[PDB]
Design a protein around this nucleic acid. Structure first.
Lengths: 195, 175, 60, 61, 50, 52, 158
RNA sequence: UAGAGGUACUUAUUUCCAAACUUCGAACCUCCUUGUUAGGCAUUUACCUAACUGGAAAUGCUUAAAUGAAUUAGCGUUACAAGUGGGCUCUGACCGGUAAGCGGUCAUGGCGAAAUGGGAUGAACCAUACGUCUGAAUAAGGUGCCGAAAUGUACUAUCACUGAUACCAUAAAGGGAGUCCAUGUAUAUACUAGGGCCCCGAAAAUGAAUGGCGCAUAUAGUACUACCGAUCUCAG
């Protein structure tokens, strides 16, 4: 099954990805990182709403899929697959290991086979987002409150100043749009550098 | 105790730019030697000026025009606690700017439990009675203030004349 | 007077820096790094509460 | 508490380890001179009389 | 059975009790060097003293 | 001991200039001039939601 | 699995910088050496005949032999207790004229320039020497830009 | 990871990564130099050069001018021989492990072989490393009583079968119109950005330990003096 995740919280080795050398690895629990109206716009869904982690530790793949399903099913219930856009901004690349044990040969040839994927967070790493309209900003905060109980440690839910997932404030966005320096890609904002 | 200081410093002349901009910082420290080090902390942190290339021109000690009378003091500060930074406007009633700043380091260490390492003041200034908006300090600017001294002290009037016996019992009533 | 001249003008008289110092050894011998007691042996400050005058330049 | 190196690396022979009268006697003669006249010649003759028999090698004719 | 493999804790201490600078006797090393050079360097010295 | 009486006087004569009513109000005016403008709002994040 | 090979743990030593691959310029082969000359060994990763060891990369020595393509270099490795001498042979394409002495030799000739020219007028000499960076004379400073630095109120900005 | 633009690929982007990826690249390190340096003169060579009144090298002569960073310090060399070849560990860096008073390395320090004082008690932590004595003033650490020394002065919090001084002798995620301080708005009042202290979350076996007694302004923070206190320091 699994260990309790208090086993694999803090980081006591170098990072250990899926590669030539690791070999016998099971694939992660996550497939979809991103749900809702993916094909939308910066201008259509300006209001954004992040979940920031306040610890330096490992986050499991099992936590991140629990957080997606609890996020979707609240936002499906309230407003009904139109406005919202959910995204997950951790990708689990670190592979865990086990000594197994299950007569026995314990602590001899201690290196162990990979058990599961994990994501290494950093103090103030955003581990989730919800982009939405001003009508359902209320619903976005109540979603990320529920998603925070999935994750280890403690974790602040924050309304961002900046538009979309773009790195531009609402004050800056009108000045660049007006200037005509910025442009619109199918999704997100692509700047014009005049070169 | 803390003394208000004004420190002005500058970077050395390069051949590219002789006579650069100097910069001043208001600092609060027990003596002239500590006041330099508080200046180099704030100058490095903000205006990008290091100890290893800069003069320091004038440590001016700010004495009060009058310490005879009482003034109100607004103190805008940030203080840092684990996981967050908070901005607070707090105010005080005192003879001088230093004694207000010495008060709030005790009050933050008391009430919020943060040391002077974490605290970073924005603005101290004296403030009039009209613009003053906090209720517990506004009461002392009114006329006809009575409060009793409930709970008197038992101390020695001089440290020679203390004693650990008494025939009669002391009365600690306000009266 | 060189200080009081500059204040009346506008400027600042910055003073001359200290040409030498006086260096009390405060802490004793033991639990100490070998580079950092090679350096004390060069000032001849071997015992606790010892002192000499030391000239100030970017070497010292 | 003082930081010094207390050990002696170098001993030196001060007076002779012979139990003769005569070698001990004329050591004190040239020791007396080597001090008092203050000269490089007599200082060497004083010290040569200190040193063991192996180092006093037999200088052939 | 299983005791320690190595340590370097107090290698530094022992080395510094005494890192004596071993000085070279002379810069030429006539076992090495070109023979054709040293061959001629003999006939410089041999011709001079006569 | 004659010289260190004279130097004691001259260093004390500077403290007459430092604690004069004329000089102290200039230094306090410099300290009042140095302080920044009053902040309208505290709080970590202002939060602006202008349409577009 | 610790190994004691010749070219071991030299992934990045004998790498060839970046846009400096290929053979060297033929100006390098035209350069000359002498006995007594101070030279620094740093390696061409390309030219494989007559390398030094990995250890004597970035290592100053003195030339003692010179030979048709290669230079015998005396270099002081630190052994265990003591500083041993090591007689290297190594090719000229791993060897450059070191600028250790060029501070010293500049001063000696600059001193003789001063010591002679003092006597030419004569007159009488002041003696120059090197000196660490020294604490400053007093002097007076007027600026006319004075900013007033203060700490701002903290805001998150995400 | 996920869209847009072209004819599954592809041109620009984007979310987010690598001990066995690198187009950039620190800190900390490391190695060489710092007194003799410029010449000029003419012998030697079977070597080098097309050639010698050249080169290369060593032998002497000599023309000039000086001892040309800091701080410290006498330096060099040989012989004979003991014990040892189980180590352990604080603070940081690290490999394996769920973790360990676990196993294996690294740097300085400590113990082993180091007393004395302090942490009630302790090999390892802090002050300090010691002849026998007599004083003074201190360090670490302390000053209700046990216990030598202020229940010190000035300023803020706290009611709980509760709290009480590094290493250290355990407590988390998550809650609270308890109280104090507090951010932004709306109309004395409603809505909350939060912060401390206190409470809940919080259950083991002999009767039980902030060291004890006890305290509630002897609890939690902050500032400034006085004072006790080591085999250190100083004086004899």
């Amino acid at each position: 099954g699994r260990r309790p995740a208090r086993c694999y919280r803090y980081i006591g080795n170098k990072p250990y990805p899926k590669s030539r050398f690791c070999r016998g690895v099971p694939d992660p629990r996550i497939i979809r990182y991103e749900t809702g109206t993916k094909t939308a716009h910066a201008k259509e869904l300006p209001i954004c709403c992040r979940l920031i982690l306040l610890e330096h530790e490992c986050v499991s793949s099992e936590a991140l899929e629990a957080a997606r399903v609890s996020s979707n099913r609240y936002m499906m219930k309230t407003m009904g697959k139109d406005g919202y856009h959910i995204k997950i901004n951790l990708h689990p690349f670190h592979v865990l290991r086990i000594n197994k044990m299950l007569l026995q040969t314990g602590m001899r040839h201690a290196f162990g086979k990979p058990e599961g994927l994990v994501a290494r967070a950093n103090y103030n790493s955003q581990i989730m987002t919800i982009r939405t309209t001003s009508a359902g900003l209320k619903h976005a905060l109540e979603a990320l409150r529920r998603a925070s109980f999935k994750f280890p440690g403690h974790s602040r839910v924050v309304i961002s100043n900046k538009v979309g997932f773009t790195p531009y404030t609402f004050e800056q966005f009108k000045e660049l749009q007006a200037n005509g320096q910025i442009v619109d890609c199918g999704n997100h904002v692509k700047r014009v550098y005049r070169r | 105790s803390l003394k208000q200081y004004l420190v002005i410093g500058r970077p050395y002349p390069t051949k590219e730019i002789p006579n650069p901009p100097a910069v001043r910082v208001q600092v609060f420290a027990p003596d002239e030697v500590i006041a330099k080090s508080k200046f180099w902390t704030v100058a490095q942190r903000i205006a990008r000026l290091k100890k290893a290339h800069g003069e320091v021109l004038a440590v001016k000690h700010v004495i009060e025009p009058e310490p005879t009378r009482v003034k109100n003091y607004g103190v805008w500060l940030s203080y840092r606690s684990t996981r967050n930074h908070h901005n607070v406007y707090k105010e005080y009633r005192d003879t001088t700017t230093e004694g207000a700043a010495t008060k709030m380091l005790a009050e933050l260490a008391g009430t919020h439990d943060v040391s002077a390492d974490n605290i970073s003041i924005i603005k101290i200034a004296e403030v009039a009675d009209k613009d003053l908006v906090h209720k517990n300090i506004s009461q002392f600017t009114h006329e006809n203030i009575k409060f009793p001294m409930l709970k008197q002290s038992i101390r020695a009037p001089t440290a020679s004349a203390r004693k650990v016996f008494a025939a009669t019992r002391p009365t600690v009533c306000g009266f | 007077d060189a200080e009081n001249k500059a204040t009346a003008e506008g400027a600042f008289y910055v003073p001359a820096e200290a040409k030498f110092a006086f260096v009390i050894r405060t802490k004793g011998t033991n639990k100490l790094h070998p580079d950092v007691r090679k350096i004390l042996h060069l000032f001849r400050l071997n015992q606790k509460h010892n002192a000499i005058f030391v000239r100030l330049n970017k070497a010292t | 508490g003082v930081d010094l190196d207390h050990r002696v690396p170098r001993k030196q022979r001060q007076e002779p380890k012979t139990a003769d009268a005569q070698m001990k006697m004329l050591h004190n003669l040239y020791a007396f001179l080597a001090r008092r006249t203050g000269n490089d010649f007599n200082a060497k003759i004083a010290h040569r009389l200190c040193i063991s028999r192996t180092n006093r090698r037999p200088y052939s004719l | 059975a299983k005791r320690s493999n190595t340590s370097a804790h107090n290698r530094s201490h022992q080395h510094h009790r005494n890192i004596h600078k071993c000085v070279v006797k002379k810069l030429w090393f006539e076992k090495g060097m070109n023979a054709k050079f040293l061959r001629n360097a003999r006939y410089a010295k041999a011709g001079q003293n006569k | 001991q004659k010289a260190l009486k004279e130097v004691a006087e001259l260093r004390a004569a500077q403290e007459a200039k430092r604690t004069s009513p004329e000089v102290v109000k200039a230094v306090f005016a410099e300290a009042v001039a140095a302080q920044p403008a009053t902040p309208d709002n505290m709080s970590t994040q202002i939060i602006n939601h202008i349409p577009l | 699995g610790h190994t004691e090979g010749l070219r071991h743990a030299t992934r990045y030593l004998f790498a060839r910088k970046f846009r400096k691959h290929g053979a060297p310029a033929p100006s390098i082969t035209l350069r000359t050496f002498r006995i007594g000359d101070i030279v620094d060994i740093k390696v061409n990763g390309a030219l494989h005949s007559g390398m030094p060891n990995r250890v004597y990369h970035g290592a100053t020595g003195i030339v003692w032999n010179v030979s048709p393509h290669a230079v015998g270099i005396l270099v002081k490795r630190r052994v265990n207790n003591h500083i041993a001498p090591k007689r290297i042979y190594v090719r000229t394409e791993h060897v450059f004229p070191s600028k250790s002495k060029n501070d010293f030799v500049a001063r000696c000739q600059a001193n003789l320039k001063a010591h002679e020219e003092a006597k030419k007028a004569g007159t009488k000499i002041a003696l120059p020497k090197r000196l660490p960076a020294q604490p400053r004379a007093s002097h007076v400073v007027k600026p006319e830009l004075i900013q007033t630095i203060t700490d701002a109120p903290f805001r998150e900005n995400w």
